[PDB]
Amino acid sequence: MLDTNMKTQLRAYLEKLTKPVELIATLDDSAKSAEIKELLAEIAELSDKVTFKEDNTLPVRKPSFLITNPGSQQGPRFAGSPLGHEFTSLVLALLWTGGHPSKEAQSLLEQIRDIDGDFEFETYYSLSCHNCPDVVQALNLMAVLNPRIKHTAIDGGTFQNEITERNVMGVPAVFVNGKEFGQGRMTLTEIVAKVD
């Protein structure tokens, strides 16, 4: 759950929201999904621009949630716990989806918006990985920027079966359209270059 520090900090960042943001979760009856429900609950009451609904009907990982805008189905998805060192990533995805501008250069955002082709990214991370945030954040931004680019950040501690199943030896481990894309550090620019 959110610790007093995260909550207070989150409350402060959210003041940057200008558009309404929705957190749509897909849960099961497991304890893990209980945590998520509690967390998305706390987050929603830190701001009136944030709503927490749930559609446990979607053919997606459980638990998981989508960060989007009302009336929209676009945005990055977090499967498992978005805390630990990914908390900054959670904050940023909320901010970006809520209208707050990325610090990236305008010409770069544009190149990202003009990317042709459909890419379904999946990134495995651990709550304690220090090099994962930048990768997760780069792919989240791309998903907020281009509806053709999807991204699901997966907490390895909630989907362990997938870690061995895909033989993930380290994190962050990124996949695109089901196939390995790259592991370890990467920049938004290095990533954008691989997908044209």
Curated annotation (Swiss-Prot):
It comes from the Bacteria. Residues 109-196 form the Glutaredoxin domain. Serves to protect the cell against DNA damage by alkyl hydroperoxides. It can use either NADH or NADPH as electron donor for direct reduction of redox dyes or of alkyl hydroperoxides when combined with the AhpC protein. Homodimer. Belongs to the class-II pyridine nucleotide-disulfide oxidoreductase family. The active site is a redox-active disulfide bond. This is Alkyl hydroperoxide reductase subunit F. It comes from Salmonella typhimurium (strain LT2 / SGSC1412 / ATCC 700720). The gene is ahpF.
